[PDB]
Write a protein that binds this ligand. Sequence first.
Ligand SMILES: Nc1ncnc2c1ncn2[C@@H]1O[C@H](COP(=O)(O)OP(=O)(O)NP(=O)(O)O)[C@@H](O)[C@H]1O
Ligand SMILES: O=C(Nc1nccs1)[C@@H](c1ccccc1)N1C(=O)c2ccccc2C1=O
Ligand SMILES: [Mg+2]
Length: 283
Amino acid sequence: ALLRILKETEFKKIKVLGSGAFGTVYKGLWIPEGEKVKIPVAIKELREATSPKKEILDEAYVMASVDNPHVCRLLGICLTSTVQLIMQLMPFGCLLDYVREHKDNIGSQYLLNWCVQIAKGMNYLEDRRLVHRDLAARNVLVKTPQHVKITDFGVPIKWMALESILHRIYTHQSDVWSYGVTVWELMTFGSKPYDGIPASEISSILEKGERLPQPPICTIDVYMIMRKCWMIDADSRPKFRELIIEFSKMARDPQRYLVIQGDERMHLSPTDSNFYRALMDEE
Ligand SMILES: Nc1ncnc2c1ncn2[C@@H]1O[C@H](COP(=O)(O)OP(=O)(O)NP(=O)(O)O)[C@@H](O)[C@H]1O
Ligand SMILES: O=C(Nc1nccs1)[C@@H](c1ccccc1)N1C(=O)c2ccccc2C1=O
Ligand SMILES: [Mg+2]
């Protein structure tokens, strides 16, 4: 009952934001009936063509029902030939591009905190018994640089856990794998995982014990957590709840666990967030 159902005439596509696996995502404008305002929105038109599924809507009723600062919520759904999902527009985009776009202007406090946040979001999804199945930096959106949120829960071979490849098994402990790649992405500043290895050969390099490398900025504490996320015996992997504590502990002394050049001139200020939070993130 938390899922507004929109008519086709009260919103319009305005700019393409990118496509991916399941759909295309536009910047749309919501025009409330009777009103002369245009409220911006993010729409994701599916890539299929719904035919009285049911299935979807029954899932959108869950997605729309996730109250947590760090996980994004489906806001509405227009059931059209191509179904349209509507959610809050995030101008900064996703954390992938953001770390890319700011390659040499990201302190250790940010990175360690993003890691904290994605964990908290993930942990909430775990507690809600939902498996993300597609956690990656491109699916972490930036509300403000200080607040990131997971989107798109509910084939990224290069992020999947070995067992999800070999046996299509998506348990929570495999999302902890994807979490491991995501942090890797964060610390490598947008690098591409296994860049060079065809995505038909990952199941083999993984079974040989091959794993992504230690990013430059990473220490032994920050890279050993990652490695655990990528262990074969699924249950030998950290629980999301234990990554919050570890990463939260490291975030309290970041220049000690991340070694970044000029880290001395790049940090979080109360005036600059009290300004950010009124204009954008009013939690
Ligand atoms: N709610 C949103 N607000 C703003 N930008 C968004 C929003 N949702 C998605 N985007 C952006 O639109 C791009 C395309 O969306 P999408 O195809 O769903 O993401 P993707 O990660 O690249 N594909 P996928 O591998 O399936 O998760 C994303 O990478 C984001 O940068
Ligand atoms: O629409 C989605 N993301 C968007 N990006 C730009 C505008 S909406 C995501 C999603 C958004 C927020 C939280 C969780 C998931 N989503 C659904 O809820 C959903 C339901 C049923 C079928 C397919 C999907 C799907 O892909
Ligand atoms: Mg996505």
